[PDB]
C-alpha cells in the first residue's frame, strides 16, 4: 500500500479470488486437478504429510 503506479484497490484484490475460481472452473478440468489441494480437501491431513 504505497503511493505507487501499481497500487491496486483493496476491493479488486479481494475480488481477484472469486475471479480466479471463475477462470479456473471455466477453463476446464485440468486446472481444477492442478489446484486439487484447493478445491478437494485431503480426507486425512495426517496422511497428507
Amino acid at each position: 500500500d504505497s503511493n505507487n503506479i501499481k497500487y491496486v484497490r483493496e476491493d479488486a484484490k479481494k475480488m481477484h479470488k472469486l475471479w480466479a475460481h471463475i477462470r479456473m472452473a471455466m477453463e476446464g478440468s485440468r486446472a481444477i486437478k492442478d489446484n486439487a489441494k484447493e478445491f478437494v480437501p485431503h480426507p486425512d491431513n495426517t496422511k497428507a504429510t
Binding site: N4, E10, K13, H16, K17, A20, A31, N35
Partner: protein, 318 residues
Amino acid sequence: SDLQVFNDWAYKTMSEVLDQQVELFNGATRGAIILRSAGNTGDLSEAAFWAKIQGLVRPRDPYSNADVAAKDLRQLVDNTIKVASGTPPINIPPSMLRWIQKNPQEAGAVIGQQLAGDTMQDMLNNGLAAGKAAFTAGGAVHDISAAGTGLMTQRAFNAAQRIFGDRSTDIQVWVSHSSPLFDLYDNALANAEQLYVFGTVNVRADAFGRPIIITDSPALVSGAAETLRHSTLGLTTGAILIEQNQDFDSTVVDGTGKQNITRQYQAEWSYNLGVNGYAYDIATGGKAPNPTALATAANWDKISTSIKDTGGVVLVTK
C-alpha cells in the same frame, strides 16, 4: 490468515516493495544521472576523443624566432565498464499458483514486483558509489569534519563551489543522505544569522537554485557511531551514466526428487556504468567489478585534463 494455509491467493499491495527512494534518474535529478536502455557487446565500451593540446598558443620573438620544438596531438580514451547483477535462487512456496497464467500467484509474479524496485536500488547504489570513488580518485573531494559539528547550513556547499571553480554554475543537483538534510533543517530552525523566517525554513535548495535530492543509499554512509560519515555529492549534467544492456533473464525449476516441491527462481541482468570524465582501470580492477571494486579508488583514472570538464564533486560531512 492465508499463512501456511493459503485461504485467498488475492495478492497484497503491502508486500514491502522497498525501503529506500530510488526514483533519481533522468528528469528526477535534472539529467544528472542518466538511465538509458542501449545494449552493447563485450565487457567494455571505450570512446576516443581528441585531447586538448597544452601549449597550443605560445609567445613569439619576431626578431629571432630561432628554433621551436615540435608538438603532436594525442587521443584520450574514455571507458564504460559493464557490471553484472543477479538474483539468488528463491524457494517458491508450494502455495504459489505458478501454473495458472491469469495474473495469479506465479513464481515471478511477486518476485518481479519486488525485483523492479531492487534493480532500481542496485543501479542507484552502484552509480553513487562509483561516482564517489571516481571523484575521490580525481581529487574533487572536500572533507568538512574538523569544523565543529561537520555540516553547515550552506557554507559546506560553498566549499564545493570553491573546489569546482568558475564553471560551478553547471552543478545543479545535491544527492545527499537524510541525516545531513535533517541537520540542515535543524540549523535552519535555529539560525545564528537571521536569514530565515518560519515560512522558509523548509526550502530544499542550497541558496543557489540547486535542489537537494534525498536518498538513504548505503554508499553515502561511512563508518558508525562516532566515525559516522555522510557523503553528499554534487553532480553536473549527465555526470553518472547507467546504460541497460536489455539482457534480462529468468528461469523456474521445481523440487524434482525432493520431499517437498522446492520450486526456485533466478534472474540475471547487466548494465553499463560510466562516470563522466573518468575511465575504469580494468587492468587494475577486474572484468566484472564487484560493488567493493567499483567503490575502490585507483580503479578510476581521470581522463580529462581539467576538473571542470569532469562532472561531479564529493562533499564529506560528519
